[PDB]
Design a protein around this ligand. Structure first.
Ligand SMILES: [Mg+2]
Ligand SMILES: [Zn+2]
Ligand SMILES: [Zn+2]
Ligand SMILES: [Zn+2]
Lengths: 168, 518, 88, 58, 84, 262, 171, 35, 93
RNA sequence: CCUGGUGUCUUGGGUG
DNA sequence: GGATTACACCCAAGACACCAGGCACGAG
DNA sequence: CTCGTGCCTGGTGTCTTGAATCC
């Protein structure tokens, strides 16, 4: 039905088992290669999004479109009624509410601070932001790929994440 | 539109990749293994599973749905089976190429007899066309009469190579054992050659002009036979309740019987000289199943005495699949009758008999501008002219106006189609055989007339090389809005008055009118 | 069964002389039983689709093998018209 | 000519047919790149915008 | 990429007989499926006639994509090509 | 031992002919110097001949019309001899497939064998009609169904024992036919049970019409099609079928041509 | 796991839709057909970016049928989960065979043989929960699980989790 | 292409050096030994 | 509609007419192909709306084609002689 | 109360 | 050694054999 | 009533030796 820029995938003589999606082994399949191409043929890094980025973009896109539907005229339950159809109403409401209960940095002030702090494979950089951690010991266990990289700063990463983190 | 809706995207064909079917792939697309030559269960209706008419292969009967795709016989394409061969046999089409490969490679390990160190040979691998490269290589290596263990180690085995000769369906290799001594030529069985071919390296596979993904060289030996569905070999009823089978059906039974007897040998009484007679016979049946015009040996015969119609003979010649059904074919919406002349018709008109005009039709789409006009045709029905034969809905269901007794209760919706009768000024393509040049096919405007001949204005007899001594001509009716416009704006008679053949007209005033005008 | 009319056959399965026939009309009714009621299959002969005329004469006899055997001759008249061919 | 031989030889050497000829497309029943088929026809979205607003798709 | 800019178009500015036939047929077809017609329809109500009327007034809303041998192409609108 | 190719089906004849030649020449100055000859059914189209010299093989076959004239004889190895002469089941309670008669192809249980050892009593699902059309072949037989003695009682029978009836001179015990077959008439090897065995074990059309108004007034015809109001009469007089309105017709009935009161 | 993907959809347009607001109809048409749908190749398509400004290109007319074919290139927010990815969740159901957890659009099933023995299902408690002493798994409790297998139905995808490992569970 | 083929073939169908159809045949068949 | 009538329509340049004659007005047939292996091996149940090329384990990359029935027949006869005619819908160079 | 299948392979004689 | 040898169309005129086994009928 | 012979049906399987040019 719907297709992408990546095409053909004609048969090759040697098979491959670096295709099976394994986040531990950095296998994201043929569609989510490290170097993608946009609809003009230009090269582009894979766009993986943390929970904090994603909350701003999706909410902005929905209210800008909602304003556009109103000729140019906050709460998650109100923002999800913009969609068309009960099937669409469901998936969008559940995604905001899920993000509403797990996004630490729920505003653009803190988020841009986290954005500048983080901006080396692009997938790992996005993983560190999504999974909250206390110490260096907790990060290399649950995410065993950070082992043999020999470039920490990790502690100051976690300290800034936890300091920017508002109380609850 | 005659096809029910399917969500799969519609695309056109841009490339045809030819190649060979691997043994593994044949099994992957097969839906059943074929073992028993008895077609019927026990002559008590319903054909035997695992037999040659196993219902998983498909339906050629209007009342049994396919047990694989659920579709009716019209839509169901048929699905292949497979038949395992007890012993690998040669493909009859590829023997002379197999023979060529033997003189190129080592008959022990299978490596190309020459390297890039040889200057002329290094030039030959650069040749871009695979066929010419393969021939250029073989032209060099032909005279190399021993596989060297050592460079001129290259991976060689040191053995001298035989001179392989073809003797019918058998290949003989004569090895020169190390002046002159005694050489012993033994038969090079398919199984022996099969194992040798699987050990050819990927790098030498490419240099031989073969292709690792599409045409791997051991796939020229047949180990499992694809069983075509019944659509390829339909049954026919000679005198209603008596049906004979297609030549392929009988021939596949013979291969299947012969396959069982090879299994019947290796487990008990094999006097060796019997194994060679039974294996060669399996090779024979598989060969004449594909090609029954093998030079130098008698043809396989039916019990009626006439030769078996092999697959190769199905495709060649004037009546075969290519020249008889694809480069040309029989077509709908055509008509033919004797022609007569009429001076009181315009140059671009053709007089069309009423009976022909009621049989042919054009599907005119219903719009706001013609809906009132088209309803009048519907009331008149198929037997009064000007009338109509069918009303086609957007779903495709046709209403046959011969049998619709409540014809007065039809209301037409926009977007429907009415197949109305042929009517005045419709363009049609007119044609007389033999079509020697482009003005053998010109578009004329219909004028419906009584009597059963086609009428032509006399000045068009010359480009058709027609006269009225018994000649017949053909009429073709375009079936859509796009082709009507193509006919009137490209092929119409007045556009054809001057021909590019000799930059001069091909029509003039002729016969009576020319005599009289002087 | 065939799509044409069977109403010109008499009870003996044969049409009688003097009856006009048109295309696809059945003129000889014959059945064949279906092997293993409602057991037979039609094997009848219709008049050629492009023709018409009058049944002129019907021969009934048996052949060398002793089964029944019929011939039906149809006559019509062809009147010259546009398109017919002539020669000195 | 040499119909079956061409096709056997084509298989054994894995020939690619790029479908640019007239004959290729005719036998596959596709619009051939010749005459009225030698180009594509696109819809002029720019010229449609000069129509009035009551003609608009909803 | 393949598209050639408007200022650098090199193919002939006259509508060919083949382009004309395809345009008339395609537009005719669309009208019979009840596409909005861009000219006044008086007495001439045949689909082909309406399409021929639109052509004569330079009002057919279609673009010719003329393929060149290498695969590149020049898009020409039927509004700008000169019809004899 | 040499093998020789012979016409299919003529192997026994060739063995016979060789024996006659051998016996006829015994003790003469030109004896046939072969020892034996034989033909194995499993080895179609071959005869084997025992001798010391190849010339004796040619001598044995000279003039034999069943032998292929090509110099096709082949030598057998000593290590292959005994296999040429290898001579090669059936137990009560086991299944076999019948090879002859209306029960051809049917699965049957072996009930018992004759004392002599030739025919075996088989237990079979019957194919009967209960004499329904009496005043059989394998192509015009009946479906299989267990014998029903009450159906036989009703429709057409001798009781012999508990659950045992003789019906039309065949024996049925607890619904099964018990019938003797030659052992050569059953298949005991490589039987494949089937799926089925696993489950078991308008009133004026075509009437003659006269036309009473119009240009065709007085002509005979037949109603070919009567969809509505407009009829299709196949006129007799010219070879044409016309469309005609219903007001214009007279229909034939018991008494003359009757208007639309029929 | 969220990504931004540049996608495209082939749209066929009937000729009766050839009016001055054609592009705006197509923009509405794209959104109705794509938003909220799932595919095994990309995951759930959550929202499309910059919907009212998408450049649809030119439509190819299909020979012989009159209808027009647009290739609408676009950019969307997509959500696909992955095997090996550790994620948080909100439990939707608790049953004798494990629990079901809503991670945004879909639901993940964790079976009993991959749950530690000390977490005991307690129906008598009010409200029902998986309980310990300093642990509390009620509906809405943050839990940390790891996706160990993805199965594809091409309509909705199904992922199976596990809490049979270190540092996974309630926090 | 096709126009060229028909333009040359059609006159041939109605038609001491060799001329007419036998000479035409030598050309297309580019025979090494002409008559 | 023989070989010589085919040539006349080419000379007229009436490509659209020639396509219709040899398809819609005759033996037009719809087939399904696998986008990966290019064979006509797709098993298509249209009322259940489920498609699968078992060889490629592919239920998503599948296309439909309109080709002559006699061409479909031709390819099945070629398959029966171990020739693989792979129909791809895109070029690659 | 809508759907609705009648053969093939040759050979010979003819038409333009 | 094979392959090449105009196009389309009409219509009338034809079809497995031999051997073995089983069943039925007639005669003793 | 039993045995033998003849006819019909079904199943399985081949073989005495006997138009011309071109590439
Ligand atoms: Mg003439
Ligand atoms: Zn099917
Ligand atoms: Zn070697
Ligand atoms: Zn595939």
């Amino acid at each position: 039905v719907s297709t992408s820029t990546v095409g053909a995938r004609r048969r090759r003589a040697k098979q491959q088992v670096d295709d099976e999606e394994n986040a531990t082994l950095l296998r994201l399949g043929p569609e989510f290669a490290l170097k993608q191409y946009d609809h003009d043929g230009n090269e582009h890094d894979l766009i993986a999004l943390s929970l904090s980025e994603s909350r701003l973009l999706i909410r902005e896109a929905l209210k800008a479109r909602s304003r556009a539907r109103n000729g140019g005229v906050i709460d998650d339950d109100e923002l999800a009624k913009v969609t068309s159809g009960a099937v669409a109403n469901g998936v969008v409401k559940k995604t905001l509410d899920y993000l509403n209960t797990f996004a630490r940095f729920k505003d653009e002030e803190t988020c841009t601070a986290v954005d500048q702090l983080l901006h080396l494979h692009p997938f790992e950089i996005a993983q560190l932001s999504s999974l909250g951690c206390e110490d260096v010991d907790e990060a290399i266990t649950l995410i065993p790929s950070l082992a043999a990289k020999k470039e920490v700063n990790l502690q100051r990463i976690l300290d800034e994440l936890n300091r920017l983190e508002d109380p609850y | 539109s005659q096809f029910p809706y399917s969500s799969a995207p519609l695309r056109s064909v841009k490339e045809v990749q030819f190649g060979l079917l691997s043994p593994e792939e044949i099994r992957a697309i097969s839906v059943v293994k074929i073992e028993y030559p008895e077609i019927m269960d026990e002559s008590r209706q319903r054909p035997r599973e695992g037999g040659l008419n196993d219902p998983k292969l498909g339906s050629i009967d209007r009342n049994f749905k396919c047990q694989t795709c659920g579709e009716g016989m019209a839509e169901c394409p048929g699905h292949f089976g497979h038949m395992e061969l007890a012993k690998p046999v040669f493909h009859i089409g590829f023997i002379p190429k197999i023979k060529k490969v033997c003189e190129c490679i080592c008959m022990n390990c299978g490596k190309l007899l020459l390297d890039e160190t040889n200057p002329t040979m290094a030039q030959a691998i650069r040749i871009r066309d695979p066929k010419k490269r393969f021939n250029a290589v073989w032209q060099l290596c032909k005279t190399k009469m021993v596989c060297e263990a050592d460079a001129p180690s290259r991976g060689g085995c040191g053995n001298t190579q035989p001179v392989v000769r073809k003797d019918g369906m058998k290949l003989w290799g004569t090895w020169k054992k190390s002046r002159d001594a005694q050489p012993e030529r033994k038969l090079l069985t398919p199984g022996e050659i099969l194992n040798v071919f699987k050990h050819i390296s990927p790098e030498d596979c490419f240099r031989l002009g073969f292709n690792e993904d599409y045409a791997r060289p051991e796939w020229m030996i047949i180990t499992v036979l694809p069983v075509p569905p019944p659509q390829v070999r339909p049954s026919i009823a000679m005198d209603e309740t008596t049906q004979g089978q297609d030549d392929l059906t009988h021939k596949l039974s013979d291969i299947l019987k012969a396959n069982i007897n090879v299994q019947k040998l290796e487990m008990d009484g094999s006097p060796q000289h019997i194994i060679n007679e039974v294996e060669q016979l399996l090779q024979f049946h598989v060969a004449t199943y594909m090609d029954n015009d093998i030079a130098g040996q008698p043809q396989a015969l039916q019990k009626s005495g006439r030769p078996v119609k092999a697959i190769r003979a199905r495709l060649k010649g004037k009546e075969g699949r290519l020249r008889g059904n694809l480069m040309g074919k029989r077509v709908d919406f055509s008509a033919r009758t004797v022609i007569s002349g009429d001076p009181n018709l315009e140059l671009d008109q053709v007089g069309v008999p009423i009976s022909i005009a009621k049989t042919l039709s054009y599907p005119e789409t219903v719009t706001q501008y013609n809906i009132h006009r088209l309803t009048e045709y519907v009331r008149n029905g198929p037997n009064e002219h000007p009338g109509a034969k069918y009303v086609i809905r957007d779903n495709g269901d046709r209403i046959d106006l011969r049998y619709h007794k409540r014809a007065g209760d039809i209301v037409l919706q926009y977007g429907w189609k009415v197949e109305r009768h042929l009517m005045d000024d419709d363009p049609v393509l007119f044609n007389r055989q033999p079509s020697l040049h482009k003005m053998s096919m010109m578009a004329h405007r219909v004028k419906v007339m009584p009597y059963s001949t086609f009428r032509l204005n006399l000045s068009v007899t010359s480009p058709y090389n027609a006269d009225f001594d018994g000649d017949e001509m053909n009429l073709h009716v375009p079936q859509s809005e796009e082709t009507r416009a193509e006919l009137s704006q490209l092929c119409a008679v007045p556009l054809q008055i001057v021909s590019p053949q000799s930059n001069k007209p091909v029509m003039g005033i002729v016969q009576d009118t020319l005599c009289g005008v002087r | 069964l065939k799509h044409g009319t069977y109403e010109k056959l008499d009870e003996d399965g044969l049409i009688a002389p003097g009856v006009r026939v048109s295309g696809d009309d059945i003129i000889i009714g014959k059945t064949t039983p279906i092997p293993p009621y409602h057991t037979k299959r039609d094997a009848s002969t219709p008049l050629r689709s492009t023709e018409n005329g009058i049944v002129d004469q019907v021969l009934l006899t048996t052949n060398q093998e002793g089964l029944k055997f019929v011939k039906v001759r149809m006559r019509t008249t062809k009147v010259p018209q546009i398109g017919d061919k002539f020669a000195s | 000519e040499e119909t079956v031989e061409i096709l056997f030889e084509a298989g054994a050497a894995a020939e690619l047919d790029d479908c640019r000829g007239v004959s290729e497309n005719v036998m596959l029943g596709q619009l051939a790149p010749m005459g009225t088929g030698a180009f594509d026809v696109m819809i002029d979205e720019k010229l449609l915008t000069s129509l009035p607003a009551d003609y608009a798709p909803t | 990429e393949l598209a050639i800019l408007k200022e650098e178009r090199t193919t002939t500015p006259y509508l060919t007989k083949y382009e004309r036939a395809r345009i008339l047929g395609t537009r005719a077809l669309q009208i019979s499926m009840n596409a909005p017609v861009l000219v006044d329809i008086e007495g001439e109500t045949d689909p082909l006639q309406i399409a021929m009327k639109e052509l004569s007034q330079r009002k057919i809303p279609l673009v010719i994509r003329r393929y060149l041998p290498d695969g590149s192409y020049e898009d020409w609108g039927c509004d700008e090509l000169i019809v004899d | 031992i040499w093998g020789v190719k012979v016409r299919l089906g003529k192997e026994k004849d060739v063995v016979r002919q060789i024996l006659k030649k051998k016996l006829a020449r015994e003790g003469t100055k030109n004896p046939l110097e072969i020892y034996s000859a034989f033909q194995r059914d499993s080895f179609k189209g071959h005869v084997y001949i025992e001798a010391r010299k190849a010339e004796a093989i040619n001598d044995a076959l000279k003039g034999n019309v069943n032998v292929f004239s090509n110099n096709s004889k082949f030598l057998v190895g000593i290590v292959e001899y005994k296999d040429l002469l290898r001579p090669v089941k059936l137990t009560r309670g086991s299944y076999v497939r019948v090879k002859n008669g209306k029960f051809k192809g049917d699965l049957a249980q072996v009930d018992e064998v004759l004392e002599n050892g030739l025919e075996a009593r088989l237990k079979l699902v019957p194919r009967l009609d209960y004499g329904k059309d009496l005043s059989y072949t394998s192509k015009f037989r009946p479906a299989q169904r267990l014998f029903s003695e009450a159906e036989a009682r009703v429709h057409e029978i001798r009781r012999d024992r508990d659950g045992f009836v003789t019906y039309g001179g065949e024996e049925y015990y607890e619904g099964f036919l018990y019938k003797t077959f030659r052992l050569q008439n059953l298949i005991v090897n490589s039987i494949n049970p089937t799926l089925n065995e696993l489950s078991l074990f308008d009133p004026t059309l075509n009437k003659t019409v006269k036309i009473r108004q119009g240009g065709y007034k007085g002509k005979i015809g037949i109603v070919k099609e009567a969809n509505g109001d407009r009829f299709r009469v196949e006129l007799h007089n010219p070879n044409k079928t016309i469309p005609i309105p219903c007001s214009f017709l007279l229909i034939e009935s018991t008494h003359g041509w009757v208007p639309y009161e029929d | 796991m969220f990504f931004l993907k540049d996608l495209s959809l082939i749209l066929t347009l009937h000729p009766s839709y050839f009016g001055p607001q054609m592009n705006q109809y197509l923009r509405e048409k794209l959104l109705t057909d794509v938003e909220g749908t799932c595919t095994g190749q990309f995951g759930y398509i959550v929202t499309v970016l910059d919907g009212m400004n998408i450049d649809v290109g030119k439509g190819r007319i299909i020979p012989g049928s009159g209808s027009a074919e647009f290739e609408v290139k676009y950019r969307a927010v997509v959500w696909k989960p992955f095997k090996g990815e550790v994620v948080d969740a909100i439990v939707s159901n608790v049953s004798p065979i494990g629990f079901f957890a809503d991670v945004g659009p879909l639901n993940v099933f964790v079976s009993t043989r991959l749950i530690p023995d000390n977490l005991v299902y307690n129906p008598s408690n009010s409200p029902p929960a998986y309980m310990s002493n300093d642990e509390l798994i009620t509906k809405g409790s943050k839990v940390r699980l790891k996706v160990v297998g993805t199965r594809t139905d091409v309509n909705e995808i199904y992922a199976i989790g596990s809490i049979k490992e270190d540092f996974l569970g309630a926090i | 292409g096709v126009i060229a083929a028909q333009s040359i073939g059609e006159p041939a169908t109605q038609m001491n050096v060799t001329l007419g159809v036998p000479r035409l045949k030598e050309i297309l068949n580019v025979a090494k030994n002409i008559k | 509609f023989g070989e010589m009538e085919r040539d006349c329509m080419i000379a007229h340049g009436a490509a659209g007419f020639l396509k219709e004659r040899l398809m819609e007005a005759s033996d037009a047939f719809r087939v399904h192909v696998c986008g990966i292996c290019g064979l006509m091996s797709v098993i298509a149940n249209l009322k259940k709306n489920q498609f699968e090329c078992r060889s490629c384990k592919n239920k998503t990359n599948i296309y439909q084609l309109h080709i002559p029935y006699a061409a479909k027949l031709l390819f099945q006869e070629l398959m029966a002689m171990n020739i693989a005619p792979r129909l791809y819908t895109e070029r690659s160079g």
